[PDB]
Amino acid sequence: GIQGLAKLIADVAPSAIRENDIKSYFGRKVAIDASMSIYQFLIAVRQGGDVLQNEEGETTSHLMGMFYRTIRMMENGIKPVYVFDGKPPQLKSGELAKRSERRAEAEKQLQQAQAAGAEQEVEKFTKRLVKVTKQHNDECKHLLSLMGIPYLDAPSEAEASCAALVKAGKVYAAATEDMACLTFGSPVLMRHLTASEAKKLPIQEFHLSRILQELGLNQEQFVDLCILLGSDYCESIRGIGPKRAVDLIQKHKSIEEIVRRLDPNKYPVPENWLHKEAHQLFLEPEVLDPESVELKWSEPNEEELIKFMCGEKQFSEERIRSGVKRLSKSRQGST
DNA sequence: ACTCTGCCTCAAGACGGT
DNA sequence: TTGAGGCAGAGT
DNA sequence: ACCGTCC
Ligand SMILES: [K+]
Secondary structure, X not given: OOOOHHHHHHHHXXXXXXXXXXXXXXXXXXXEEHHHHHHHHHHHOEOOOOEOEOOOOOEOHHHHHHHHHHHHHHHOOOEEEEEEOOOOOHHHHHHHHHHHHHXXXXXXXXXXXXXXXXXXXXXXXXXXXXXXXXXXXXHHHHHHHHHOOOEEEOOOOHHHHHHHHHHOOOOOEEEOOOOHHHHOOOOEEEEOOOOOXXXXXXXXXXXXXXXXXXXXXXXXXXXXXXXXXXXXXXXXXXXXXHHHHHHHHHHHOOHHHHHHHOXXXXXXXXXXXXXXXXXXXXXXXXXXXXXXXXXXXXXXXXXXXXXHHHHHHOOOHHHHXXXXXXXXXXXXXXX
């Protein structure tokens, strides 16, 4: 994430966002952040406050979500490649650790809810306690393998590896809600791509070059701006938000300069501010080699699919086999 | 009055059958 | 996790 | 569209 970046671009660079109907992404490949979508499902796919599961106790909401949305996308001519998060950059420790503490917090607030009724709390805190695990990951990779859908492991940050794939032309765009993908230099970002039957929000397409033009910056100044707005990798200056940050970056072009010209009594900066290191992470992140693996959208293995989902995970053979045929079908073509 | 902060709420997908 | 949106209040 | 259920 980059705090407020979406609203900012809407506000001061509206020409950088197009809204298109899904019909116009027909025949395009997109890169998807696996870990974020798995998360979205673990949160949303709930039956009675609880997550879907086979009786052995193993979770399955993520498998549901992934299987079906993937199929939908494929039907609409959208070939998705899933990129899985690698090892988090050191600069991320801070953010990550906060995320642990809050979870611990939630967990305590779980007990005091359970021992006092009102499942409103129980389910709220339970949602706040959601966490993607290496198991979730391994399972989804298996599923995608048996669906013929290609997946890649990012050495570190998935978003950075997505931006790398779009840069290299291996895909048209990155489909994610994480504005940071632009910071890492991805020329095109697509929010709200679900290929879902109930629509909801219109697909949003962000062009990086348009953002740059409309804001009057180059990529480097744009990274600095995102750092000021609020990145996952270092702190921000208290009291400088979107409006002020745009002003300052437009006037002084860099963080060093900005820090020289700032009144240290009105706007004091953070102590031991790793902003230069963050910046360098954004310009030169560790990413996979987009030329190593040639992405192929294979044919589903229907039998093995039934064995895995239906067999191991108690999925209705009819719903599954139906999905498998919609997908095998969409491979040869169609609507 | 503009801006930011921080504390809060609240919600989070897809399908099949009407 | 991400919003959007709500509000009080401090600080300009 | 609504909504009961998917597991
Ligand atoms: K800030």
